């Protein structure tokens with residue numbers, strides 16, 4: 075939001091306005107990174123970003139502590155070296171390379187299509203980076219009619235996404251990624267769980283309208299009463315939430331589920347790629363931005 079708008083105080087006293095991304099700007103397959111870039115907390119063009127810039131932006135504008143993104147940082151730079159074919163040091167080339175398939179980016183996402191989803195030819199690939207309304211709807215449909223959802227509901231949503239991806243992806247492509255996706259499930263509970271409820275820390279409930287605003291608009295739901303978590307969220311909350319999701323009892327099992335879908339997942343660890351491995355090509359689609367309606371500087 076613009077200075078003098080009042081939006082943000084007293085949680086974020088140094089806000090910057092929303093600015094839609096241009097056709098030449100680099101965006102990522104991550105709702106959090108795109109929202110930061112849209113507000114200029116990290117380069118608006120999504121290029122040449124350092125670990126320090128990332129750490130401060132998340133902490134000071136999203137209520138996310140450094141511990142939460144420690145592994146994410148390591149993995150972002152592992153992917154950068156893999157894609158560019160060289161050490162990126164302390165400057166992430168751009169946000170787009172984060173969409174390299176079967177790396178940090180994975181199949182069965184909540185709001186993005188898979189790299190080979192519904193393609194007729196084995197050599198084809200599609201946009202697995204930009205927000206996809208239709209895909210997001212398949213996630214929302216699981217909790218239709220509700221204003222909040224818990225760990226059990228989240229477990230159901232991810233199972234529905236794995237089922238659909240397993241059926242729609244070109245034969246041989248689908249690769250399950252429970253460890254990474256569920257850290258992201260933890261990310262959702264950490265950012266948009268209803269802190270107005272007295273037991274928010276023990277049994278967090280995600281507010282659906284907040285989640286929808288963040289994902290669809292790639293900006294913050296201040297208009298809906300949201301504000302960055304305070305105190306800032308720590309990694310402990312995230313992995314605990316991750317484990318709780320996978321541990322929830324399933325009351326509706328979708329068909330065509332990959333083997334081992336229901337059950338605990340392994341701990342997420344640093345990625346590693348062989349120097350001889352050639353990376354898959356990145357989708358070149360221009361960056362997505364909300365158009366129904368378009369957003370103003372304070373949205």
Ligand SMILES: *[C@@H]1O[C@H](CO)[C@@H](O[C@@H]2O[C@H](CO)[C@@H](O[C@@H]3O[C@H](CO[C@H]4OC[C@@H](O)[C@H](O[C@H]5O[C@H](CO)[C@@H](O)[C@H](O)[C@@H]5O)[C@@H]4O)[C@@H](O)[C@H](O[C@H]4OC[C@@H](O)[C@H](O)[C@@H]4O)[C@@H]3O)[C@H](O)[C@H]2NC(C)=O)[C@H](O)[C@H]1NC(C)=O
Nearest residue numbers: 098099100101157158167168169170171352353354355356
């Ligand atoms: C964000 O950053 C990413 C990462 O940098 C950007 O994506 C990358 O963008 C570049 C363009 O800037 C794009 O490069 C082209 O790739 C063409 C296809 O290459 C593959 O297929 C053919 C193989 O022969 C080739 O391997 C051999 O050649 C390359 C160099 O071409 C060499 O490194 C290898 O070691 C092999 O010897 C490769 O596997 C390629 O044809 C094309 O080449 C031409 O460009 C100039 C010279 O290199 C050359 O003489 C040619 O004239 C060029 O390299 C990458 O493909 C792409 N990477 C991926 C993984 O998608 C992204 O664009 C950025 N986006 C934003 C919005 O900022």
Ligand code: HEM
Nearest residue numbers: 103104106143146150178179180183184185186258261265
């Ligand atoms: C700091 C470094 C971070 C990096 C490098 C990063 C990277 C990524 C990548 C590569 C994806 C795509 C994975 C996929 O295929 O779904 C992703 C997804 C996601 N990220 Fe981030 N991210 C970071 C931090 C965060 C944080 C802290 C939050 C929120 C509090 C967040 C929330 C999400 C969510 C919810 C998704 C899932 C989107 C979907 O499945 O549709 N990210 N991120």
Ligand SMILES: *[C@@H]1O[C@H](CO)[C@@H](O[C@@H]2O[C@H](CO)[C@@H](O)[C@H](O)[C@H]2NC(C)=O)[C@H](O)[C@H]1NC(C)=O
Nearest residue numbers: 283286287288290291297298364367369370373
């Ligand atoms: C995306 O953002 C826009 C702009 O803030 C949202 O539309 C407004 O939402 C508020 C409540 O947050 C309403 O009171 C306004 O009247 C809406 N304005 C318009 C022009 O529609 C929109 O709802 C957000 N999208 C999602 C999916 O949450």
Ligand SMILES: *[C@H]1O[C@H](CO)[C@@H](O)[C@H](O)[C@@H]1O[C@H]1OC[C@H](O)[C@H](O)[C@H]1O
Nearest residue numbers: 156346347348349350351352353354
């Ligand atoms: C790259 O290639 C060397 C041998 O040339 C392997 O030892 C590496 O582990 C790595 O191999 C992967 O990448 C290239 C091929 O696709 C190969 O199938 C793959 O296993």
Ligand SMILES: *[C@@H]1O[C@H](CO)[C@@H](O)[C@H](O)[C@H]1NC(C)=O
Nearest residue numbers: 082083084085086087088134
């Ligand atoms: C914002 O300013 C008020 C006083 O003007 C202060 O109490 C509050 O803690 C500030 N918040 C932050 C995150 O700086």
Ligand SMILES: *[C@H]1O[C@H](CO)[C@@H](O)[C@H](O)[C@@H]1O
Nearest residue numbers: 253256316317339340342
């Ligand atoms: C989230 O975190 C828990 C605990 O580390 C894992 O079991 C889960 O697979 C996901 O990585």
Ligand SMILES: *[C@H]1O[C@H](CO)[C@@H](O)[C@H](O)[C@@H]1O
Nearest residue numbers: 309310311312313314341
């Ligand atoms: C979730 O799990 C992680 C390890 O995966 C712990 O470090 C954290 O304290 C929480 O229990």
Ligand SMILES: *[C@H]1O[C@H](CO)[C@@H](O)[C@H](O)[C@@H]1O
Nearest residue numbers: 275276277278311314315
């Ligand atoms: C780990 O932490 C989460 C979030 O605080 C709890 O919901 C869970 O019960 C576990 O104690």
Ligand SMILES: *[C@H]1O[C@H](CO)[C@@H](O)[C@H](O)[C@@H]1O
Nearest residue numbers: 313314315316317318321
């Ligand atoms: C991972 O962590 C959560 C925390 O409550 C447990 O519910 C789960 O059973 C696993 O131990």
Ligand SMILES: *[C@H]1O[C@H](CO)[C@@H](O)[C@H](O)[C@@H]1O
Nearest residue numbers: 216226227230324325326
């Ligand atoms: C059983 O309960 C879960 C949530 O606890 C639902 O998501 C499912 O649809 C069924 O009603």
Ligand SMILES: *[C@H]1O[C@H](CO)[C@@H](O)[C@H](O)[C@@H]1O
Nearest residue numbers: 323324325326327328336
């Ligand atoms: C649907 O079926 C699975 C096993 O196939 C159960 O784990 C689940 O509880 C639900 O009844």
Ligand SMILES: *[C@H]1O[C@H](CO)[C@@H](O)[C@H](O)[C@@H]1O
Nearest residue numbers: 216230234326327328329
């Ligand atoms: C119960 O609910 C799950 C998730 O919505 C479905 O995948 C299943 O087919 C049944 O409708």
Ligand SMILES: *[C@H]1O[C@H](CO)[C@@H](O)[C@H](O)[C@@H]1O
Nearest residue numbers: 200201356357358359360
């Ligand atoms: C790469 O290809 C996409 C579509 O496949 C274009 O929209 C983009 O501009 C670039 O040419």
Ligand SMILES: *[C@H]1O[C@H](CO)[C@@H](O)[C@H](O)[C@@H]1O
Nearest residue numbers: 364365367368369370371
């Ligand atoms: C996007 O564009 C529309 C129409 O120009 C405006 O209503 C909105 O404020 C945003 O600037």
Ligand SMILES: *[C@H]1OC[C@@H](O)[C@H](O)[C@@H]1O
Nearest residue numbers: 226321322323324325326
């Ligand atoms: C709910 O609790 C977990 C599982 O036993 C399931 O079958 C029940 O419906």
Ligand SMILES: [Mn+2]
Nearest residue numbers: 180181183186
């Ligand atoms: Mn994905």
